[PDB]
Amino acid sequence: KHDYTNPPWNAKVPVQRAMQWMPISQKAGAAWGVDPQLITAIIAIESGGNPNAVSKANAIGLMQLKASTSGRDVYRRMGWSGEPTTSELKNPERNISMGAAYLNILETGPLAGIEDPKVLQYALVVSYANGAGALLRTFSSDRKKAISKINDLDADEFLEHVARNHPAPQAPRYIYKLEQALDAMLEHHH
C-alpha cells in the first residue's frame, strides 16, 4: 500500500518550464491524436522541461525516451528501420513528436478498449512509467479480461488499485504527480 503522496511534489516550476514547449506539444499532439496537456505533464515530470535531460539507461530529452526500446517501437510503427539517434532525441521537436507517438502506441495498443478517458489517462502514465504489462497483470494474465476489469473502475478506484497492487512504487506516484501537474497548468490558462 504505497505512500504515493510522500514526499509532496511541487509542480509549479517543472510545469512553468514544460509550458515553454506547449506550442510543440500542441503541434505534436494535434498530429498524433494525443492530448497536449498530458504531453506537457509528462515533460514536467520527466525532464522538468530540460531538453538535454538524461536518465535511466540513456533515456533522453524532454520526455526522457530511450532509443533502443520506446524509440525503436516508434520507428517500427512508422515502418522505419533502426531507431532515433541521441541528437534527434535532444531535439525538442523530434523528442516531443516521438513521445506523443509512443503515448499513442500505448493508448491504441495494449490499452485499447479502456472506455473512460480519465482512467485511460491514469493507465497511460502508469504504462509510460513501468510498462503496460505490469499494470495489466495486476488485473489478469489475459489482456481482454484485464481491460474488462479496468473498465469496471472509475479513476479514483483505479488509483486505489494501483496503490494497493502495483509492484512499482513509481506507478501510483506518477498518477499523483500527473494531477499535481494538471493543477499547476490551470494557472497558465486565463
The residue whose grid cell reads 531507431 is 83
CB 140 within 8 A of CB 149: yes
Take residue 182 and report the three cell numbers written for it.
494538471
Q: Containing domain of residue 46, as a range? A: 1-190
Kindly report each contact of residues 58-61 with a partner whose C-beta sits within 8 Å and lies 24 or more positions away, as own/partner. Answer: 58/86, 60/86, 60/89, 60/90, 60/95, 61/89, 61/90, 61/91, 61/92, 61/95
Count: domains in the chain: 1
The CATH code of the domain that includes 174 is 1.10.530.10
Residue spans of beta strands (DSSP E) within the chain: 54-55, 59-60, 65-66
- Neighbouring residues of 21: CB distance < 8 A, sequence distance ≥ 6: 40, 43, 49, 51, 62, 92, 96
The CA distances from residue 134 to 25, 95, 147, in Å, are 28, 25, 13
Phi and psi at 51, nearest 5°, equal -75, -5
Burial of residue 140, with CB atoms counted within 10 A of its CB: 0-12 exposed, 13-18 middle, 19 or more buried: middle
8 A C-beta contact, residue 183 and residue 11: yes
At 66, give phi and psi (nearest 5°): -95, 130
Q: CA-to-CA distance for 150 and 161, rounded, in angstroms? A: 10
Sorted by sequence, the CB contacts under 8 Å of residue 27 that are 6+ apart come out as 93
Q: Which of 73, 60, 62 lies closest to 102 in space, CA to CA?
A: 73
Which helix or strand (DSSP H or E) is residue 89 part of?
helix 86-90
Q: How far is CA 22 from CA 56, 77, 143, in A?
A: 25, 25, 34
